[PDB]
Design a protein around this ligand. Sequence first.
Ligand SMILES: CC(=O)N1Cc2ccc(N)cc2C1
Length: 185
Amino acid sequence: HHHHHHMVHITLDRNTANSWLIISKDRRQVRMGDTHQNVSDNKERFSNYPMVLGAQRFSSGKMYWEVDVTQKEAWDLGVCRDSVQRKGQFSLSPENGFWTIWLWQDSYEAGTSPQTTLHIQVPPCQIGIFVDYEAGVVSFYNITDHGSLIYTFSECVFAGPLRPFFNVGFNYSGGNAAPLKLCPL
Ligand SMILES: CC(=O)N1Cc2ccc(N)cc2C1
């Protein structure tokens, strides 16, 4: 891919974070804390899962960013509508306003309904995410494997402003404490 030149500087929005997340001072890294992080509740926070949004909102254009997933066992990445549900249980699907991929139990899957099996030969340490708003496209790239394509959602019906979406995953195993990190341009 040659999407690198649409690079955007993403930062995380503390106000949207699940109350157990710890976001770095530079707002470029997030990890699961071992307890509640002593913040007030608000209507923006994801309550049920270790999720957080980017601060940036996109309603046009082409955008590209990269995320480091080194040594994690579980995570979700992509974009979502600004108006997605925050409270209670929900599935990650385009019908619910999410365009995502994930790692879970040693398999990679795209957040379609039902989910789609991904075929990745080189487990990624960094993921590239490309959004073309006008084209209705969200694509995922394996930066560890020379930028190879992972998955493309096409004919996307965004139906509103988009935000970068992150899930650091639970850490029941003790093997998933590592952060998600936004990689430098
Ligand atoms: C609401 C719910 O079922 N959750 C969210 C959450 C957050 C942190 C921890 N340690 C456990 C759980 C389970």
